[PDB]
Design a protein around this ligand. Sequence first.
Ligand SMILES: Nc1ncnc2c1ncn2[C@@H]1O[C@@H]2COP(=O)(O)O[C@H]3[C@@H](O)[C@H](n4cnc5c(N)ncnc54)O[C@@H]3COP(=O)(O)O[C@H]2[C@H]1O
Ligand SMILES: Nc1ncnc2c1ncn2[C@@H]1O[C@@H]2COP(=O)(O)O[C@H]3[C@@H](O)[C@H](n4cnc5c(N)ncnc54)O[C@@H]3COP(=O)(O)O[C@H]2[C@H]1O
Lengths: 141, 134
Amino acid sequence: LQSDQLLEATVGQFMIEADKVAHVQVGNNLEHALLVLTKTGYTAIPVLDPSYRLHGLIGTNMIMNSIFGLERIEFEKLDQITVEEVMLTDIPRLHINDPIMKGFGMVINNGFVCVENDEQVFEGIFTRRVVLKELNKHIRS
Amino acid sequence: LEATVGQFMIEADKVAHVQVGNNLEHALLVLTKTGYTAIPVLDPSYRLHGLIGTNMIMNSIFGLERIEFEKLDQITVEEVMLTDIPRLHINDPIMKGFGMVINNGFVCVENDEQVFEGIFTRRVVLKELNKHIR
Ligand SMILES: Nc1ncnc2c1ncn2[C@@H]1O[C@@H]2COP(=O)(O)O[C@H]3[C@@H](O)[C@H](n4cnc5c(N)ncnc54)O[C@@H]3COP(=O)(O)O[C@H]2[C@H]1O
Ligand SMILES: Nc1ncnc2c1ncn2[C@@H]1O[C@@H]2COP(=O)(O)O[C@H]3[C@@H](O)[C@H](n4cnc5c(N)ncnc54)O[C@@H]3COP(=O)(O)O[C@H]2[C@H]1O
């Protein structure tokens, strides 16, 4: 796109598509979430319900907060607690047709923002890296 | 502009850190409590040695058969930390920092003696860029 087109673009045109987004389910236990986070290398990822609607975010710090005990790391709790119980639910959301400037503003305070369609089906994530890389092209030239 | 990294960086005394020689359990506890996912590793001279974060800590104890939580207090941060990292000077132009945060959530600011001065974060870049577009 040319610079006089970037502001008119949509969030969906620059998001990471959902089939490339690591995620877990609300009903998974924290051991499964910790394995997915660690193996994919990400510090926080979306949490979906079985019908593919976003309900929250789960991250390593949330999980460790649940198992750092008084005397020891209580790793047995990883199999006893579900993602639902500790996930972050107050998160912003974008629509695939949202103007990209709405996404630009939301990533000031958020490393990524989840994107859904009009029926709340999860569609992908809008990340700071993609924003920064594209603004890279247009401030320069 | 003529704006510099030093005018927009998070100053060092506001930055969470650990020290070389600290073990991974301490570092993971600090990350968990502060809520940050990666922070600088300093020495007692306040020099920057690398970055430590939750992902690299978890990968260091992610075994074939089990998560080896008991190893966390047996491994020092310097055995796991990332050292091949970009660096900024306080007088660098803000656009040089902008380039460096494309691939990095933050970039450390330091002087020629490797003394740690602050971090240049994506958030401060994005706030200023939003001002410019808007
Ligand atoms: N495999 C990899 N290859 C190259 N660089 C990597 C990388 N993993 C992480 N990074 C770098 O680290 C930044 C912070 O990652 P973090 O996992 O904390 O934070 C990530 C993570 O929470 C989430 N995320 C990104 N891509 C994801 C994906 N495909 N699936 C799930 N979550 C993802 O969005 C946040 C912001 O991502 P963003 O790309 O802006 O920023 C990333 C990227 O610049
Ligand atoms: N206490 C808090 N208050 C408000 N918002 C908060 C927050 N903790 C995290 N966030 C938000 O989450 C983003 C990603 O944080 P993360 O810890 O993964 O990644 C952070 C962390 O690795 C590091 N960082 C930022 N501030 C730090 C500090 N004071 N001390 C140590 N490390 C810091 O720089 C990365 C990028 O930070 P940035 O501010 O651009 O982006 C932050 C910010 O938008």
